[PDB]
Every structure is written in structure tokens, then in C-alpha cells.
Design a protein around this ligand. Structure first.
Ligand code: HEM
Ligand code: HEM
Lengths: 137, 138
């Protein structure tokens, strides 16, 4: 990640958190409508994805700080059947939500920095889970 | 965070440092123990430091790939009494060794990039170990 990227992330995350309810609801709505194939893996509706990504993003410069959380989430993802190829899909629907919320602030550079950040974050869960799947055998 | 020229220097030069491994490792431990006798007790001689840092450095763009190893080394470090403030000293002596081997190739930008890389690497261990020290008290 280049610094302008990190700068965008650091500066905008608080705006996204402000609109959390909206990003979260829009995300899950679109995820499930556009990708019914993931429905089976999941008042008890999931809610934590988008805010967790925001939280990691907030920690983008020191991801090892959030390992204790990442590790336990990894355990549930490996239990549920989450695959590496699922990540780009969740990323797309998350970015679409960030896009709707930022509205006119939704610069391509900004959107592009969010794409990059999610990737980096997703890269951590993907490797940790690969490692846990291997340990299981 | 780490810029490309730095990642570039690391990726390009690690293979050269690994070729001189025996020399960096032996210069490193010798200097460490001679210059910082206070750490002696925490440690049939250790040998894995410098080569492990090189390996991590080689994985500089995807540090999560080496977590299974980092996690296990963390456990031994917390068992031994390793502290965050120890990191800068191990870094100083690793850097002086790198400098000796690179000889005339030891440019300031090269030494600087290694300094930065060591920093990033150490921060991972420092953070996992802090988390493990807490986990021991709850
Ligand atoms: C970096 C990206 C992701 C983050 C930050 C993340 C975050 C989380 C969190 C915080 C939880 C709940 C943990 C709990 O409290 O036990 C969770 C559960 C879950 N996540 Fe993710 N996740 C990510 C990627 C994905 C992907 C790519 C999928 C694939 C569909 C997915 C599917 C699931 C499922 C199926 C569960 C358990 C759900 C349930 O039984 O309701 N996640 N995730
Ligand atoms: C990022 C830097 C570091 C790396 C890559 C690293 C790597 C390692 C490795 C691979 C081991 C052996 C683990 C085993 O095979 O169980 C080890 C053990 C050890 N390291 Fe580190 N270490 C680092 C930093 C430090 C620091 C800052 C100190 C403090 C002086 C230190 C002191 C120790 C000690 C005391 C042990 C155990 C030795 C024994 O078993 O007698 N390490 N380290």
C-alpha cells in the first residue's frame, strides 16, 4: 500500500463508520440478492462484516494488532466453509455499499484506495484460514 | 508503510545475504553477546536469528504467510523473557553484520532499507508476543 492510499483510508474510515448502519444493511442485502449461492453458508441475521473491515482498515498500518480477532474469526470461517474465491465477491459488494454511501465524495481514487485496502485485509484472513484448513488434516 | 524501492532492495539483496549466511550469523551472535552482556542469561549456541529474519524478509510482502512460524517463536520468546526494548538492540547488531558482509556494496540506501525491513518484521513479533504476555494473565 502506497501512502496516498493509506492516507485516504485513514481519513475516510471515520466517515464510513459514521454511516455504518447504511453500509452494513446495503452490503448484506446486495450480497445475498446477487450471490444466492453463499446463502447456505450462513431475527438472527449476520451484521458484523462491514464494520470489522472498517476496524481493520483503521488498523491498516499495524494489522498484527488485530490478530487475536482475526484468528477467532478465521476459526468460524473455516468451520463454515469460507473459500479464498469468496473474498472478491464480498469485496465487490462492500465497495458497492461504500460507493452508495460516499455519494458525491465517492472519488475513483478513493474507491480505488478502498479496493486496495480490502484486498490487503482479505489477504490476511485468506492466508490464516489456509493455514488452519491445513492444520485440520 | 514500506515503499517500493525498499521492498525492491530487500527482494534483490536477500539472496546475496543468504549466500553469506554463515558469516552474518556468526558475526551477529558474537557482536550481540560481546556488546550486550545483559542479554546473555536469557539464552550448544543459538544460530537461527539472522537466517530467520532473512526468511521473513524474503516474505516481506506477505508476512501473514509466515505466522505459523512467528507464532511458535513468540511462545519461546515469551517463555524466555524477551521484551520489546530488546528488538532495537538485536536490529543494531544484525545491521552491523549485514554491513560487514555487504562490504563495498553496503550502500546507505541498502543499509537503510534493511533497517526498515527489520523494523517491520520486529513489529510483528513485538505485537504477537505482547498479546501472548496478556493472554497469560487472562
Ligand atoms: C476480510 C473480510 C471478512 C471479514 C472482516 C469477516 C468478518 C466476519 C466476522 C467478524 C464474523 C463473525 C464472527 C463471530 O462473531 O463468531 C464472520 C462470520 C462469518 N463470515 Fe466473514 N468475514 C470476511 C469475509 C468473509 C467471506 C469472504 C465470506 C464468504 C461468504 C464470509 C462468510 C462468513 C460466514 C458464513 C460467517 C459465519 C456466519 C453465521 O453462521 O452467521 N466472510 N465474518
Ligand atoms: C525479529 C527478530 C527475531 C527473530 C526472527 C527471532 C528468531 C528466533 C528463533 C527462530 C528462535 C528459535 C526458536 C526455537 O527453535 O524454538 C529464537 C529464540 C530465541 N530468541 Fe529470538 N528472534 C528475534 C528477536 C529476539 C530478541 C529481540 C531477543 C532478545 C535478546 C531474542 C532472544 C531469543 C531467545 C532468548 C531465544 C531462545 C533461546 C534458547 O532456546 O535458549 N530474540 N529467536
Amino acid at each position: 500500500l502506497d501512502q496516498q492510499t493509506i492516507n485516504i483510508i485513514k481519513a475516510t474510515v471515520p466517515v464510513l463508520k459514521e454511516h455504518g448502519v447504511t453500509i452494513t444493511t446495503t452490503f448484506y442485502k446486495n450480497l445475498f440478492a446477487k450471490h444466492p449461492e453463499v446463502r447456505p453458508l450462513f431475527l438472527e441475521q449476520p451484521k458484523a462484516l462491514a464494520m470489522t473491515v472498517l476496524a481493520a482498515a483503521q488498523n491498516i498500518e499495524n494489522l498484527p494488532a488485530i490478530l487475536p480477532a482475526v484468528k477467532k474469526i478465521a476459526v468460524k470461517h473455516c468451520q463454515a466453509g469460507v473459500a479464498a474465491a469468496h473474498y472478491p465477491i464480498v469485496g465487490q459488494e462492500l465497495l458497492g455499499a461504500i460507493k452508495e454511501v460516499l455519494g458525491d465524495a465517492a472519488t475513483d481514487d478513493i474507491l480505488d484506495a478502498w479496493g486496495k485496502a480490502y484486498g490487503v485485509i482479505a489477504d490476511v484472513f485468506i492466508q490464516v484460514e489456509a493455514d488452519l484448513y491445513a492444520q485440520a488434516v
